[PDB]
């Protein structure tokens, strides 16, 4: 069977390093707001060209953290694109504030810049952009709206650790990055964890704050806050992986460029990055007509497949109140998307025997 | 110095077990959800003797679940002590809900059970009851109210963890218990930690939903959810000391055996548990109206003290809007405590040294 993402294989890489370092922590007796989240958080932020990063304990946190710092009014939008992982939208939801949903250009499965104007309002705040599996949101049209209505762009990072636009890093492309470091990421915990990136010292402190029940001076609470901590252990862990990120990126860019170049099944559209360096290769996304039906013989040809995702947020009995609207290019993605296997230990021979079976299936 | 606490100390009795429990994770490629979690829970759920138990991320998040659950009409209140931690009152606040606060027992540091009917109003809709300081809060009159006017109790027993009320352990005496496995606790991980014990199984099965984006089935969102998770490392560490909580509690009881026998000085206000198993002492906490002075002199003598808590919630930036009201017997718990140091890994000879030190003061 190729595995989709071998967890096991990508961290046995670091083996005797990961050992290291959860001693080192150890051994230091301080399990949170230590040395190993000072040092992460600096590589960090220097990685993404940041002055500031603030660990936290998840990437939804993070966004969460991101939203709630800003203090909107209670009637305040949030712009956000209807085809992303529901976790984008959930923070808004979890802020008490109304999601905005606009459709992806099917081209790039991210938000269409050109189709959000119609539906700012003079109760609209933020976008949350994000750049799905690994590709950066052109942000020209962005940034250009953004600044005509005074609005803040939060940046979902949770797919695209390392992605470039216009020379610069995700997490450094709006107001503020907010980064997953699931397992299962480009850059990956043995935990949950996350992290917000941002250049203004002031949003940095209060988010630093609010993730530490609203305390920066022991026994004093400036704010209501969360409880949202990267482990020192996990901290440790992401520093050491760092190193390696652009490796690993590189690693999967390659497994990309195999599917990009021997694919040759007209039923089956392939992803097209407009530069290479703003694609990461999260998620390897295809399209089909037949998508239930491709992965049911890619199982039987020893090939595990995930789907990211089959039903949109708008479906969800989550947002049951939203069932009934109409995103017909959310609702057709979500129908026709596999995911491929990716990742930086797949061997280059696996993908070559994945696309001659893909061209087999027509 | 006398330490407060000496997490290395704790945690180092267990230094072969712990390196083994966090090699069989890493082995198995499994970091959350997974057959240390499933252990963890079913080990904590038979000790408390609830028929469930859900991990959760951290003891706020608990709290956050437990009440976000519920789904209470967003014009609710929930009762709390105005005494506790600052978390207990967040958690309602996080929630989009409003705290009404209740004055402890000076006797007890617990809410005072004959001071909450007063506050109850057709909008109540729980109880926080708070096992502050490691002792079980007297259920009897609570039980009694939270019927009459079909309330929730929802124990916060982030320091309390094995105390007995009536042969029933705390998180066995309402309708869901909330704990911390923060490092410090009576019950320690080596990261944020928490989880939920109930013997609703409705309740456990919504509260596992919400905690993983509102998902028990993969692609399927059922909830509006959250991500609080309890990684499978840390439940690797909790059940491991699981098995030593007992042992580790009486060891803190004969610390504070020795206070409570040897400290003779009429200016200080010992702690008097109603039964010895319904204190665990979490915290070991003093009183007296030169509490700064007593520090600094304690210090000088070579002992370390923290206080919990100098400055109560409703004084709190964070409760701006609440500075002005008036918990006299909270303002004056926050005036005067001050925390001993316990543990179970503290020699006795340093509490007997303490206990002279302290009569010295005199
Ligand atoms: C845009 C965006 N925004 C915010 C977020 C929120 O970030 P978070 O709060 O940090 O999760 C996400 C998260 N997004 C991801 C989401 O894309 C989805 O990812 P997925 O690929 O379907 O996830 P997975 O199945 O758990 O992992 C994939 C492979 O990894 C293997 N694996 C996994 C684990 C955990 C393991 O321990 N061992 C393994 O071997 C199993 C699978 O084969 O679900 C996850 C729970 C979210 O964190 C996002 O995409
Ligand atoms: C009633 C109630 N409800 C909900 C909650 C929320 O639970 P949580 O969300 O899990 O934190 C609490 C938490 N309550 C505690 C609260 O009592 C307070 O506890 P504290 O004793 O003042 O905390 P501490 O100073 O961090 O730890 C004490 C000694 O431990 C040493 N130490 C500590 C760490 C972390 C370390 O890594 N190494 C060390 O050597 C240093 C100190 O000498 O602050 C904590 C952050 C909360 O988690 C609560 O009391
Ligand atoms: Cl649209
Ligand atoms: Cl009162
Ligand atoms: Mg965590």
Redesign the pocket.
Same mark, same amino acid.
């Given at each position: 069977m190729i595995?989709? %993402?071998? %967890?096991?294989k990508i961290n046995q890489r670091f083996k005797s390093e990961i050992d290291l370092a959860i001693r080192e922590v150890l051994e230091s007796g301080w399990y949170l707001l230590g040395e190993k989240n000072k040092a992460f958080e600096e590589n960090f932020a220097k990685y993404c060209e940041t002055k500031f990063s603030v660990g936290c304990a998840?990437? %939804?946190?993070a966004?969460h953290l991101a939203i709630r710092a800003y203090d909107f009014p209670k009637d305040s939008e949030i712009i956000v694109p209807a085809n992303?992982?529901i976790?984008?939208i959930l923070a808004i939801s979890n802020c008490g504030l109304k999601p905005i949903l606009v459709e992806p250009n099917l081209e790039t499965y991210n938000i269409d810049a050109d189709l959000i104007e119609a539906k700012i309002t003079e109760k609209t705040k933020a976008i949350v952009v994000?750049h %799905?599996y690994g590709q950066a949101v052109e942000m020209e049209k962005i940034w250009e709206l953004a600044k005509k209505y005074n609005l803040k762009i939060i940046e979902?990072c949770? +797919?695209a650790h390392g992605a470039i636009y216009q020379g610069k890093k995700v997490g450094n492309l709006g107001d503020i990055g907010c980064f997953?470091?699931?397992?299962?990421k480009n850059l990956g915990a043995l935990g949950?964890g996350?992290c917000i990136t941002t250049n203004d010292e002031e949003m940095a402190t209060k988010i630093r704050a609010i993730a530490n029940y609203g305390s920066l001076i022991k026994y004093e609470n400036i704010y209501k806050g969360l409880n949202s901590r990267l482990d020192e252990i996990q901290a440790a862990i992401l520093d050491l992986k760092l190193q390696f990120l652009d490796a690993d990126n590189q690693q999967r860019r390659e497994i990309a460029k195999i599917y990009r170049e021997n694919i040759k099944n007209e039923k089956i559209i392939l992803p097209k990055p407009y530069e290479e360096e703003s694609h990461v290769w999260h998620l390897f996304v295809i399209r089909t007509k037949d998508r239930d039906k491709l992965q049911e013989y890619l199982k039987i040809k020893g090939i +595990?497949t995930?789907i990211?995702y089959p039903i949109p947020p708008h479906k969800q009995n989550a947002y049951k109140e939203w069932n009934n609207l109409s995103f017909p290019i959310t609702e057709k993605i979500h129908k026709e998307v596999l995911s491929l296997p990716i990742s930086p230990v797949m061997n280059k021979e696996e993908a070559f025997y994945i696309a001659q079976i893909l061209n087999e299936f027509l």
């Open positions: 595995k989709f %993402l071998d %967890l096991h998840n990437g %939804l946190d966004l992303t992982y976790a984008s994000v %799905l979902d949770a +797919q997953s470091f699931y397992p299962g949950d996350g +595990q995930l990211h």
